[PDB]
Structure formats: structure tokens, C-alpha cells
């Protein structure tokens, strides 16, 4: 049962009914998502109306431009701090930890729900580079937990990793699907990021609930007024051969850029911690840091100033719509991306760089925020840059004669966005996500090629963004196995296990019991039938063995030496050791046991003897090295 | 291990290196698939040429129309019987069994490869209602095995289940993708039919190899000479919000029909097994059953006779093309579907019924064949029937606001095809498969609704086709847990385990060993430290224990050689018992352990004391009841 500890950036953790459930879950998530999107749109409309309402001078315009987001972010941070501090940042690493059996103290309560909803609505109502995929996963999980509490549904199960898995996994799928407005892509994306082994049954349940959410969204849209970023490209040979190398280059560069983004985020988090005086000073005044970051970012996007060279007038939706259009800029979209004192290439480059560092910095402030849409937009810009370069180099066409069939620079943007998002998140379901978002499937082969290349390059350099956050927040972490090297198949348990394995016997006089407990820094002590045979029987928890010493050594009626020879273990609570290891088990079989069986450690036996132990620490050392 | 036994229909079973591997696998599978498609096209073209060439008499036309498929089927059956009898069937149940660690004697060899390829080419060229998805899975796995033999790979792995999965999961994904010309949908479909838990790493590897296969296919197509069944529907309001109940009805009807199809296939297999004299007479002349079935089916599809009332002149591809067209028949597409003596409704109904029973019977014959395309075509016909009925009931449109938007009966056909295929195979990836096949995503919501409803109903009624075939072949069978009842969460291990476990002690005087071996019938016997303590240590196989007993009772250098002194277990082999269960373990965790860890039994221990055992049979009864 870990407990949250507040920090400047992120934080730290220290020591017949199924169908009704799914229908209600989908309906609730659809309604919540609709209300929140309405609120965010209203906030953005208010921002624009105030921006154009007071256009007296540069001073007043700048004051409004920098004072609206600062106030919104400050209110969001203060409200989150007062209600529930644990509800800041992305909620995907935390739910991945929870689905492995770990318990977080108050992660799925009602105050956390209210704080996350209000904080996300206020934080996305400004113009900061933030997403909402992790927050939506967490919100859907809280919806599922409250629904299960209302009608008692999963109380029968005994294990933690089995009771949580069903409802929470379906909820994660629904949350991603409602965020992206893409059911199948959302379910596939949620499977990849929140687990390693996923049952087909839970895939079916997520599919069902996501379909119901999509139906509710369609009914609401018809009742009021593909869906998000529909593109209109020509269906007659949209791309030719001899253009595939461009998509391969996009994929490789996207892999490198995604690794760099994850590294920059971690480096930003680490540097602030090392600086001590600044850290304490900012900890006394918590609200200063989000406000200072917002004021720095909003000043550089002021349109009359430096914001004209990076298309600072457009919103995130407007930016994504203009980059996906079916027009060639080299031969509103252009007017925003073509300033009178600049080209489209310079504007695209400046947008890419500035948005890169801005998003990396902004995704660390203490508000409920995500990181999918920023990197999606950066990838779209990079793809558009490559596509415009290709169109400028081949004005008439690439395939033999002119043939009236020229390069479509929007397809390159569609490819690059998915490639960079997949490189950052370590997923390949961004392909299906972009197919559902754009409403067209013509550029399927280039998208797949770029996404696979980006994943292959990125996995060889850095962990996923969520794995990085897991490492930062000091949460339990199993390292992902590896791809492209066959040296892991020759590593066995006998070469990574530790033969210390502190233990007690059945005889186990208090003289013997005291020495073993203080000689180790672990959490549990193994139990053996006899020190001659050392046959494993189970474990004994640290908080219990001290009670065995405490209950005996407590004042009762020098005398301290009259209470050591015997022992009692019938009154003790001995947990079993069902899953063990053999000397010749491989590294891959060990990884499978740790990931899905809900265990943290495993004991190695020959026949019944206790020869060594393997913990998560040895697994990290073996996999990394 | 298991060995193949020949019966009438299905048979019985008794008793960076990774990058190079994936690239070579993709290239090899693409080349083999291209060659097979060319051969099948040539055979079908020869059939059409023979049919068109002679018009002298009706008798000669009938003779040719019946002689060609009979000759092809007889040659395919004879060649497959001579070379490798195990090559007959679907190939997916056996690969799913192999992926769980079970060893089939000669399933992946070179003779089996040759037999499968030639038999599939001859059987698919006849024109019978047969598919090629499972055979493609088997061929891809054989290619992967031969390639891993040529490049010494995956030798370091110790366990069979861990070693087989790494090499064969990507192969199965590539096989399905090459069969359907749909990379993503093929990978997803292969995950669902061959496993219960699938890692994300193998998903990435299958994605990579499928992308390379798609690239090779595109290169061959465009450069040496997309959307196999391409559809062209209007993109402005393809369907209305009032037509969703029609798609729901299609889904439920498809679920019922898929369950019925599986039941009929099983009943056909069973009913001919219980006849003794007929079965023996058919085994004496084996080639008489496939020839009789081919003669019966091809007679009824003769266009001058009964074939005109069922559109027997069209091939499978031509049948699927006309059902997906963008025209309304009620108002070569409707020419074959509108005979002078009938109309479209009667022709569609007769086609549905005839192809239903013909496909079941043809799938139960001993040639390399599958069952995906026939059920796809039946679903397409049912969808077209519903769409035509809807368009005839609303000639102007479902909404009177404007008459521009009317019903498109092709979308109904696509929805019905996906729904029935998913109901039969118990998969939801048929949605993505049909999106990739038709090249459009406009009908995504109705397709998803129908597919999920069909899956729910069919899963509630019957097992899938592959599970049914596994049961028929008497392969090791692990039933699926279930969906929508919630009563499985109250079942614990204590309620399903048996308390009489055959076991021996460490002392084990030879009389005790004899009595224990006599009292048991299982494969192994548990080993306990002592009858007083009952501490589990491992197991002894039947072969080893009978070998020890015989060696002790063998003539040693009336009968005083009984020699019933205590046994010596040091020289014996004791396989460990790593994974055990406690009395409060749930049904779901037991199912997870059985499915993922590659075990067929598990012992129940309480502080090391043996108290029971759980095998596959007890799990089957618990899940079924
Ligand atoms: Cl997002
Ligand atoms: Cl098929």
C-alpha cells in the first residue's frame, strides 16, 4: 500500500451482470467525455472572444494573452492541490502499476475523480501543449470502480491481480477510445500500454463497451449536430513507388526524435531535483512554478511578437486541420503558415523545435495532463516538412512522365504524426488510430512501414515515456525484454540468482530467529522444515516476525534468557510459495511469471531445497546488462 | 508426443538475428503465396475454358462440368494420402495445440510441406466451397521451422512452450495476412484463434513481418505487371440512424447461424463415424468418399439444371464481387442473380441454404482446406437479402426530408459477411479484415455492432469451429472461461480438486511401490518426503517407475528373488513441481496458469502437504458446469 509524496515535478510513492456493467460503463464514459469536451470548447471560445474584444493596443492584447492561461493554470493547480494531490500528471503508469496487483492509497476515490475532472477541464482550457489520454484512462477507471461499488460485482475473487484486471482493463480501453474517438484503435492502444499479456476475453469486453460508447456518441451528435480530422485525398494512386524511401526516412527520424523526447523529459525532471536551494524555494511557494512556466510559454507564442514565426495564432485543432489539408503550399492554412517575412520551410522548422522543447517542459507541471496530442502535432509538422520538400523537388511528378499525378504533402504529415506518436509511446496501434481519425485508408502501407521503423529504432535507445515516469515516481518496475538480440535466450536462472536467501527453520530458537532477521534488509524470511534438508515451506512477513519477538520479549512475569529455546509457528500466518523456479529455467519464462502471475519474487529449488532467490532487482540487472 | 491415425474425415491423435529471421520469413511467405495464387488462377481459367469451349450438347457440358472437379479432388486426395496423411484438414487446431507445448510427430517437415502445397493447389482449383486460411497458417509455420533449421536459432531456450511461441507466432500471423491480403487484420485474427494470452512483443514481430510481406506483394503487383474486393459506396450519408436495428438483427441472426454451422459440421462428422459397415467399406476404398461428395455437389451447381436458381455459373470471387456492388437489384451483377423464372429474393434464399449445407459437407472431406471464405460468402448473401428487402420497403428513403439518400444494399452485405465469419470463428478481427479488404471505413459502426452481437450470441451457444475440430481429433482441450454469467468467480480450487492423489514415499519399500502402481492409472505419481509429513517434492513418470521395478525384479547375478527391500530413488529421474495451487485459488487464475505456463496438471499443497490435484478433466467439468 504505497503512499503519495508531493514533489515539484510528478511525485513519489513510498512504503447476466457483465453486459449490464459494460453497457453502463460505456454510457457513463460517453456522457462524461461529452460534457468535458463541451466545457473545454466553451473555455476556448471565451478566450478567443476576449482576445478579439479588447484590441486597443499591443499592451492590452499582450496582457490578455498572457493573463488568461496563467489564471487558468494557477486555478487548476490550486484546486488539484487542495482536493487530491495524487491526481496530477498522466494516469497510465499508475494504472499499469495497479493492474499488476500493487495498491495505491486513494487513487480511485470520489475526491480524486472531482479533482481530475475539474483540473483537466481548466488546464486544457488554456493554450498549453497538453493532452488528455492518461487523464481519460484514469477517469474511466474511476467510473468503473464506482460502478462496481454501486452494484457489488467482483467481490468473489481472491487475488488482487485477478479482481482488478477485468473491470480496470475494460475501463482503460473505453477511456482511450473516448479520448481519440476511435474505438478499435483505442482498445488496441490501451492493451499495449497498460499490460504485457492480455487475454482475448478482456479484448472482447473492451470491444463491446467501446462499441456502445461509439453508438452513444453518434446518437448525441445526431441529436445536437472521420469525425475529428477527416482528410480528402485523391483515391487514384495517392502515392507511387520510389516514394517509399521518404516514408522510411520519416520512420527512422521519428524513432530518433521520440527517444530524444523521452530523454529530454527525464533530464528536465532530474535537473530540477539536483538544485537544492531553488527546489526548497519553489516548494515553499508551490503555485509559482506552474505560473512561471505558463508565462514563459505564452509570451513566446504571442502572435504579434515571436508567435507569427511559429503559427501561434492557430489552436491545436486548427494546427492539425491545416497540416492535413489537400493543398500544396509551395505552389486558413497558408496564411498562418506563410508569414510575410518568412517561408513555409522556416516556419515549419521553428514550429517543430519550439513545440518540441515547450511540450517536454510543459508535461511536467502539477496539473492533470497528457502527452499524446503534442507529439502528434510535432510529427504532423515534420511529415509536412518532408512532403513539401519532396513536392518542391519534383514539381511535375516522380513516376516516369508527368502523368498529372503529383505528390500529396498531406499524406506525409499523416504518416509522420503516427510515426512519432508510436515512437514516443512504444505502440504500433497508432496506425489504426490514424486510419480511424482521418477516415481514409489509402496511405496504409507507408503508415505501417514508418510506424514499424520508428518503433524498432526507438526501442533500441530509450524506454517508453510511461516506463520513464514509472522509474521517476519510484514505482515497481519490471523492465521490458528486448527485440533484435538473441543473447537473452542463453541466460538462465542459475546465473542471476542470489544464494544468500535469508531463512528460518522449524526448530528456530529465538536465539536463531533474532540473528537472521537483523542480518537482512528484505521484507520476508523464508521458512524451511529443517536446516539439514532446507525443504521450502513458505515465507514469513517482516511485520509478523518482530511481533513474535515482541510478544515474547514484552514485559511478562535476567529473565530475558528464559524465553529463547522453544518456538511456536502454529499461531503464525505463513503465506505459501506456489510458484518456484528451477536452475535451468530461461530468462523469458521468468519474465512471463513475474509479469502476469502477480508475484514480486520467486524461490529457486532443486527438489525441495532452498538454493537461491530471484527478485525484481536481479531481473533489471540481467535484462539491462 | 502424439501420432496421427487415419479415419474417414478428420483423423485422430493417439498415445540482429531477429531482423534477418523476420525479413526472410516475410519474403518466403510472400513468394509462396504468389506462386500458389498463380497456380489456382491457372486451374480455374482452364476450367472456364473447358466449359466455354464445347457447346455441342448438354450431355457433354454436364460431363465436363462434373469430370473436372472430380479428377482434381481425387488427385489431391491421393497425393496427400501417399506423401503425408497428416496434411489433411485445417491446420489451425494443430498449430494451436503445438503452441501450448504439445509435440506432434511429423507435423512440420518437408514432405508435409510438399503435400500441403500441392493438395491445396489442386483442391482450391476444383471450384468446391473451400478456404485456404488454416492451410496458409500451417504452410507459414513450416516455412519458419525450415528457416530456423537452416539458420541455427532459438536453440538456447529450455522449455518447449517458450521456444515454440517465439518462432511460430509470427509465422501464423504472416500466414493469415498473406491469405487475406490484410496485414493488420491478419495479425489480429491469428492472435485470437491460436492462443489465449498473447504478448505484445510477438504482436510487434508479427506486425513487422506482415509489413514486409505487404511491401513485397505491392512491389510484385505494381512493378511486375490492392483491395481484393474493392467497394465504391457514396461517402455522403452512407447510412441513416434509423437503419441500425437492421444491422443489429443481422448480427443476432448471424450469431445463431454460425452456431448452427458449427453444430452441423460436428453432427456430420459424428453421424458417419457410428455406422460400422458403411465406414469400413469406405475405408477399404478410400478415394470413393471425396469423389462421391464432389460428384454430388458439382451436379447441383450445373447452370442448365438446378444451378441457375442458385447462381452456379459464378465463381467464388465473382460471387463476392456482385454482392458488394453499388447498385440496387430491385431498383453480370444481377444477371446471374435474376433468372428468367425467378427473382432476386428466391435466388438469394436458395443460394444461402444450398451453400450452407454444401460448405459444411465439403469442409468435412480429407483434403487440405479451410472454411473462412464459404461462410464469408454466405454472410454476404444474407446481408444482401436484408439490404434488398430494406430498399424495397423504402423506395424513396428512410427519411422523407430529402429523397437523395436511399438504402445502399452493398453495405448490408459487408456487415453480414463480417458478422457471420466472426460468429463462426469466434473473432472480432473480421471487422478490421473487411475494412482492409473493401478499402473503405464508412460502415465502421454497423460492422462493429453486428460483429459484437454475433460474437456474443454464438459464444453463448456453441464453441468455435477450431475448438470443435480439436475435440473431434481428441487433442488436448482447454475450454474458454465464458462471458456474461459471472458465476465462475465463486468457484475455488477446493471445490474442483480430487483428494486421492497417487503418491509414493521416500522410503518406499518395493511392495508399497507395487501397490501404488497397481492402484493408479495416470501418467505420473507424486513424491512425498514421508507418509507422516506428505511434503511434495516432485513426480515420477510411469515409464521410469516401471523400468525401476522391472530392473529390480529382473534376473540378478522356487522364486526367492522377490527382493522387496526399500527402493533407491537417487538414480531415478524426478521432474520438479514448480507451479502449485492453494485451496482458495480462483477458477480464473487456475485457467491462466494452465493456459500460459504450459502445464497439464497441478498439485494442491497446504504448507507443503499434498492434499489434491487438478487436471484438465476437472477444469473442463468445472468450466462446462
Ligand atoms: Cl491526447
Ligand atoms: Cl479463406
mmCIF file of C-alpha atoms in Angstrom, chain A residues 16-19 21-22 153-159 161-162 166 183-184 188 191-192 195-201 203-205 207-208 210-211 214-215 218-219 222 226 230 235 239-241 244 426-429 431-432 435-436 439-442 444-445 448-449 451-453 455-456 459-460 480-487 489-490 492 527 529 533 535-538 574-582 584-586 588-589 592-593 596-598 605-608, chain B residues 16-19 21-22 153-159 161-162 166 183-184 188 191-192 195-205 207-208 210-211 214-215 218-219 222-223 230 235 239 241 244 426-429 431-432 435-436 439-442 444-445 447-449 451-453 455-457 459-460 480-487 489-490 492 529 533 535-538 574 576-582 584-586 588-589 592-593 596-598 605 607-609:
data_model
loop_
_atom_site.group_PDB
_atom_site.id
_atom_site.type_symbol
_atom_site.label_atom_id
_atom_site.label_comp_id
_atom_site.label_asym_id
_atom_site.label_seq_id
_atom_site.Cartn_x
_atom_site.Cartn_y
_atom_site.Cartn_z
ATOM 1 C CA UNK A 16 -26.138 -11.610 -16.887
ATOM 2 C CA UNK A 17 -24.249 -8.926 -14.979
ATOM 3 C CA UNK A 18 -21.248 -8.440 -17.267
ATOM 4 C CA UNK A 19 -23.357 -6.959 -20.062
ATOM 5 C CA UNK A 21 -21.760 -3.499 -16.293
ATOM 6 C CA UNK A 22 -20.291 -2.876 -19.749
ATOM 7 C CA UNK A 153 -19.802 -7.264 -8.818
ATOM 8 C CA UNK A 154 -16.252 -8.586 -8.343
ATOM 9 C CA UNK A 155 -16.131 -9.373 -4.625
ATOM 10 C CA UNK A 156 -15.894 -13.127 -5.135
ATOM 11 C CA UNK A 157 -12.346 -13.203 -6.498
ATOM 12 C CA UNK A 158 -9.432 -13.562 -4.071
ATOM 13 C CA UNK A 159 -6.244 -12.461 -5.852
ATOM 14 C CA UNK A 161 -4.234 -9.171 -9.970
ATOM 15 C CA UNK A 162 -7.397 -11.075 -10.987
ATOM 16 C CA UNK A 166 -11.257 -7.334 -15.750
ATOM 17 C CA UNK A 183 -12.909 2.507 -30.753
ATOM 18 C CA UNK A 184 -10.743 -0.230 -32.270
ATOM 19 C CA UNK A 188 -5.556 -1.749 -29.194
ATOM 20 C CA UNK A 191 -3.798 -3.043 -24.437
ATOM 21 C CA UNK A 192 -0.241 -2.167 -25.491
ATOM 22 C CA UNK A 195 -0.005 -4.629 -19.860
ATOM 23 C CA UNK A 196 2.261 -7.235 -21.433
ATOM 24 C CA UNK A 197 -0.042 -10.269 -21.673
ATOM 25 C CA UNK A 198 -3.703 -9.567 -22.414
ATOM 26 C CA UNK A 199 -6.469 -12.144 -22.558
ATOM 27 C CA UNK A 200 -8.685 -12.329 -25.620
ATOM 28 C CA UNK A 201 -11.753 -12.229 -23.350
ATOM 29 C CA UNK A 203 -10.248 -7.673 -25.581
ATOM 30 C CA UNK A 204 -13.808 -8.739 -26.426
ATOM 31 C CA UNK A 205 -15.199 -6.910 -23.383
ATOM 32 C CA UNK A 207 -14.559 -4.026 -27.846
ATOM 33 C CA UNK A 208 -18.171 -4.330 -26.669
ATOM 34 C CA UNK A 210 -16.211 0.816 -26.904
ATOM 35 C CA UNK A 211 -18.872 -0.017 -29.495
ATOM 36 C CA UNK A 214 -19.423 4.994 -30.153
ATOM 37 C CA UNK A 215 -23.159 4.403 -30.577
ATOM 38 C CA UNK A 218 -23.361 9.058 -32.735
ATOM 39 C CA UNK A 219 -26.804 9.465 -31.161
ATOM 40 C CA UNK A 222 -27.349 13.464 -34.432
ATOM 41 C CA UNK A 226 -13.727 10.548 -39.857
ATOM 42 C CA UNK A 230 -11.332 13.950 -41.843
ATOM 43 C CA UNK A 235 -8.188 7.860 -54.361
ATOM 44 C CA UNK A 239 1.274 7.644 -53.679
ATOM 45 C CA UNK A 240 3.726 5.968 -56.039
ATOM 46 C CA UNK A 241 6.740 3.755 -55.617
ATOM 47 C CA UNK A 244 8.671 4.663 -50.021
ATOM 48 C CA UNK A 426 6.154 2.401 -27.943
ATOM 49 C CA UNK A 427 2.997 1.372 -29.807
ATOM 50 C CA UNK A 428 2.009 0.248 -33.291
ATOM 51 C CA UNK A 429 -1.741 0.868 -32.854
ATOM 52 C CA UNK A 431 -1.684 3.179 -37.406
ATOM 53 C CA UNK A 432 -5.263 2.064 -36.728
ATOM 54 C CA UNK A 435 -6.907 5.358 -40.017
ATOM 55 C CA UNK A 436 -9.956 5.970 -37.831
ATOM 56 C CA UNK A 439 -11.430 8.407 -42.207
ATOM 57 C CA UNK A 440 -9.318 7.101 -45.101
ATOM 58 C CA UNK A 441 -7.171 4.001 -45.554
ATOM 59 C CA UNK A 442 -5.267 4.852 -48.760
ATOM 60 C CA UNK A 444 -1.868 2.264 -45.120
ATOM 61 C CA UNK A 445 1.402 0.728 -46.331
ATOM 62 C CA UNK A 448 2.780 0.766 -41.358
ATOM 63 C CA UNK A 449 6.337 0.994 -42.704
ATOM 64 C CA UNK A 451 5.447 3.097 -37.608
ATOM 65 C CA UNK A 452 7.359 -0.194 -37.514
ATOM 66 C CA UNK A 453 10.671 1.501 -38.318
ATOM 67 C CA UNK A 455 9.271 1.541 -33.030
ATOM 68 C CA UNK A 456 12.309 -0.565 -33.925
ATOM 69 C CA UNK A 459 13.059 0.668 -28.513
ATOM 70 C CA UNK A 460 16.821 0.282 -29.023
ATOM 71 C CA UNK A 480 10.571 -4.893 -20.960
ATOM 72 C CA UNK A 481 12.518 -7.831 -22.538
ATOM 73 C CA UNK A 482 14.155 -6.880 -25.798
ATOM 74 C CA UNK A 483 13.954 -7.148 -29.540
ATOM 75 C CA UNK A 484 16.708 -7.670 -32.099
ATOM 76 C CA UNK A 485 19.241 -9.593 -29.995
ATOM 77 C CA UNK A 486 19.247 -13.334 -29.318
ATOM 78 C CA UNK A 487 21.680 -13.271 -26.375
ATOM 79 C CA UNK A 489 17.888 -16.902 -24.684
ATOM 80 C CA UNK A 490 21.164 -18.236 -23.238
ATOM 81 C CA UNK A 492 19.381 -18.895 -17.135
ATOM 82 C CA UNK A 527 10.716 -20.979 6.176
ATOM 83 C CA UNK A 529 11.405 -27.698 7.591
ATOM 84 C CA UNK A 533 17.172 -30.655 4.485
ATOM 85 C CA UNK A 535 12.859 -28.008 2.325
ATOM 86 C CA UNK A 536 10.915 -24.872 1.420
ATOM 87 C CA UNK A 537 7.503 -24.412 3.038
ATOM 88 C CA UNK A 538 6.684 -20.723 2.704
ATOM 89 C CA UNK A 574 2.584 -18.304 6.820
ATOM 90 C CA UNK A 575 1.886 -17.358 3.224
ATOM 91 C CA UNK A 576 2.597 -20.099 0.664
ATOM 92 C CA UNK A 577 5.124 -20.195 -2.177
ATOM 93 C CA UNK A 578 3.132 -21.645 -5.087
ATOM 94 C CA UNK A 579 5.365 -20.556 -7.972
ATOM 95 C CA UNK A 580 9.025 -21.595 -7.777
ATOM 96 C CA UNK A 581 11.952 -21.700 -10.195
ATOM 97 C CA UNK A 582 14.439 -24.310 -11.378
ATOM 98 C CA UNK A 584 17.616 -24.245 -15.876
ATOM 99 C CA UNK A 585 14.582 -22.020 -16.448
ATOM 100 C CA UNK A 586 15.210 -19.347 -19.056
ATOM 101 C CA UNK A 588 11.876 -15.442 -20.819
ATOM 102 C CA UNK A 589 9.979 -17.931 -18.660
ATOM 103 C CA UNK A 592 6.400 -14.322 -18.000
ATOM 104 C CA UNK A 593 5.893 -15.461 -14.396
ATOM 105 C CA UNK A 596 1.250 -11.869 -15.241
ATOM 106 C CA UNK A 597 1.191 -14.089 -12.146
ATOM 107 C CA UNK A 598 1.171 -11.066 -9.835
ATOM 108 C CA UNK A 605 14.564 -25.136 -5.676
ATOM 109 C CA UNK A 606 16.333 -28.288 -6.860
ATOM 110 C CA UNK A 607 13.988 -30.895 -5.357
ATOM 111 C CA UNK A 608 12.671 -29.148 -2.257
ATOM 112 C CA UNK B 16 20.450 -8.707 -35.185
ATOM 113 C CA UNK B 17 19.255 -12.243 -35.842
ATOM 114 C CA UNK B 18 15.583 -11.399 -35.287
ATOM 115 C CA UNK B 19 15.519 -8.849 -38.112
ATOM 116 C CA UNK B 21 14.661 -14.087 -39.492
ATOM 117 C CA UNK B 22 11.587 -11.873 -39.875
ATOM 118 C CA UNK B 153 18.198 -20.205 -33.999
ATOM 119 C CA UNK B 154 16.286 -20.388 -30.696
ATOM 120 C CA UNK B 155 18.359 -23.359 -29.530
ATOM 121 C CA UNK B 156 19.153 -21.948 -26.104
ATOM 122 C CA UNK B 157 15.569 -21.993 -24.841
ATOM 123 C CA UNK B 158 14.816 -24.813 -22.421
ATOM 124 C CA UNK B 159 11.015 -25.139 -22.284
ATOM 125 C CA UNK B 161 6.186 -23.709 -24.892
ATOM 126 C CA UNK B 162 8.600 -20.777 -24.622
ATOM 127 C CA UNK B 166 8.832 -17.164 -30.367
ATOM 128 C CA UNK B 183 -1.704 -7.313 -42.744
ATOM 129 C CA UNK B 184 -3.169 -5.815 -39.565
ATOM 130 C CA UNK B 188 -5.126 -9.711 -35.108
ATOM 131 C CA UNK B 191 -3.716 -13.826 -32.282
ATOM 132 C CA UNK B 192 -7.339 -14.667 -31.469
ATOM 133 C CA UNK B 195 -3.801 -18.504 -28.281
ATOM 134 C CA UNK B 196 -5.437 -17.207 -25.104
ATOM 135 C CA UNK B 197 -2.736 -14.805 -23.867
ATOM 136 C CA UNK B 198 -0.545 -13.111 -26.471
ATOM 137 C CA UNK B 199 2.464 -10.998 -25.572
ATOM 138 C CA UNK B 200 2.934 -7.557 -27.060
ATOM 139 C CA UNK B 201 6.445 -8.455 -28.264
ATOM 140 C CA UNK B 202 5.139 -11.196 -30.546
ATOM 141 C CA UNK B 203 2.483 -8.741 -31.735
ATOM 142 C CA UNK B 204 5.295 -6.378 -32.749
ATOM 143 C CA UNK B 205 7.181 -9.176 -34.517
ATOM 144 C CA UNK B 207 3.430 -6.657 -37.386
ATOM 145 C CA UNK B 208 6.981 -6.317 -38.725
ATOM 146 C CA UNK B 210 3.412 -8.772 -42.139
ATOM 147 C CA UNK B 211 4.528 -5.288 -43.194
ATOM 148 C CA UNK B 214 2.764 -6.468 -47.827
ATOM 149 C CA UNK B 215 5.687 -4.487 -49.239
ATOM 150 C CA UNK B 218 2.887 -4.421 -53.610
ATOM 151 C CA UNK B 219 6.263 -4.432 -55.367
ATOM 152 C CA UNK B 222 2.813 -2.747 -59.395
ATOM 153 C CA UNK B 223 6.309 -3.318 -60.794
ATOM 154 C CA UNK B 230 -12.914 -3.077 -53.619
ATOM 155 C CA UNK B 235 -19.265 8.939 -48.856
ATOM 156 C CA UNK B 239 -26.479 5.050 -43.853
ATOM 157 C CA UNK B 241 -29.505 6.415 -37.793
ATOM 158 C CA UNK B 244 -29.116 0.465 -37.019
ATOM 159 C CA UNK B 426 -15.308 -16.541 -32.525
ATOM 160 C CA UNK B 427 -13.286 -13.481 -33.567
ATOM 161 C CA UNK B 428 -13.900 -9.732 -33.664
ATOM 162 C CA UNK B 429 -10.997 -9.003 -36.041
ATOM 163 C CA UNK B 431 -14.209 -6.141 -38.812
ATOM 164 C CA UNK B 432 -10.665 -4.921 -39.473
ATOM 165 C CA UNK B 435 -12.174 -2.802 -43.707
ATOM 166 C CA UNK B 436 -8.844 -3.722 -45.286
ATOM 167 C CA UNK B 439 -10.721 -0.401 -48.755
ATOM 168 C CA UNK B 440 -13.352 1.803 -47.092
ATOM 169 C CA UNK B 441 -14.221 2.613 -43.485
ATOM 170 C CA UNK B 442 -17.572 4.358 -43.950
ATOM 171 C CA UNK B 444 -17.427 1.000 -39.326
ATOM 172 C CA UNK B 445 -20.142 1.433 -36.676
ATOM 173 C CA UNK B 447 -19.966 -3.548 -38.805
ATOM 174 C CA UNK B 448 -18.784 -3.305 -35.198
ATOM 175 C CA UNK B 449 -22.326 -3.567 -33.804
ATOM 176 C CA UNK B 451 -19.849 -8.359 -35.233
ATOM 177 C CA UNK B 452 -20.064 -7.939 -31.465
ATOM 178 C CA UNK B 453 -23.697 -9.101 -31.299
ATOM 179 C CA UNK B 455 -19.920 -12.997 -31.255
ATOM 180 C CA UNK B 456 -21.928 -12.690 -28.041
ATOM 181 C CA UNK B 457 -24.760 -14.938 -29.240
ATOM 182 C CA UNK B 459 -20.182 -17.714 -27.882
ATOM 183 C CA UNK B 460 -23.187 -18.227 -25.614
ATOM 184 C CA UNK B 480 -12.681 -20.968 -22.741
ATOM 185 C CA UNK B 481 -13.827 -19.479 -19.452
ATOM 186 C CA UNK B 482 -17.028 -17.786 -20.599
ATOM 187 C CA UNK B 483 -18.628 -14.360 -20.908
ATOM 188 C CA UNK B 484 -21.715 -12.875 -19.292
ATOM 189 C CA UNK B 485 -22.772 -15.092 -16.367
ATOM 190 C CA UNK B 486 -20.382 -14.132 -13.516
ATOM 191 C CA UNK B 487 -20.864 -17.426 -11.623
ATOM 192 C CA UNK B 489 -15.934 -16.077 -9.741
ATOM 193 C CA UNK B 490 -17.378 -18.051 -6.803
ATOM 194 C CA UNK B 492 -12.395 -22.150 -5.847
ATOM 195 C CA UNK B 529 9.210 -36.889 1.752
ATOM 196 C CA UNK B 533 4.725 -35.334 6.557
ATOM 197 C CA UNK B 535 5.766 -32.866 1.755
ATOM 198 C CA UNK B 536 5.639 -32.696 -2.038
ATOM 199 C CA UNK B 537 8.987 -32.959 -3.826
ATOM 200 C CA UNK B 538 8.215 -33.891 -7.422
ATOM 201 C CA UNK B 574 12.427 -36.619 -10.616
ATOM 202 C CA UNK B 576 10.113 -30.874 -10.297
ATOM 203 C CA UNK B 577 6.697 -29.407 -9.495
ATOM 204 C CA UNK B 578 7.286 -25.650 -9.764
ATOM 205 C CA UNK B 579 3.700 -24.385 -10.037
ATOM 206 C CA UNK B 580 1.260 -25.367 -7.282
ATOM 207 C CA UNK B 581 -2.173 -24.185 -6.156
ATOM 208 C CA UNK B 582 -3.669 -23.318 -2.772
ATOM 209 C CA UNK B 584 -8.553 -20.679 -2.202
ATOM 210 C CA UNK B 585 -7.260 -20.116 -5.740
ATOM 211 C CA UNK B 586 -9.945 -18.993 -8.170
ATOM 212 C CA UNK B 588 -9.685 -17.780 -13.430
ATOM 213 C CA UNK B 589 -6.160 -17.977 -12.031
ATOM 214 C CA UNK B 592 -4.442 -18.652 -16.562
ATOM 215 C CA UNK B 593 -1.794 -20.968 -15.105
ATOM 216 C CA UNK B 596 0.171 -19.782 -20.138
ATOM 217 C CA UNK B 597 2.634 -21.949 -18.202
ATOM 218 C CA UNK B 598 2.233 -24.995 -20.456
ATOM 219 C CA UNK B 605 -0.361 -28.022 -1.274
ATOM 220 C CA UNK B 607 2.323 -25.659 3.841
ATOM 221 C CA UNK B 608 3.962 -28.224 1.577
ATOM 222 C CA UNK B 609 1.490 -31.021 2.362
#
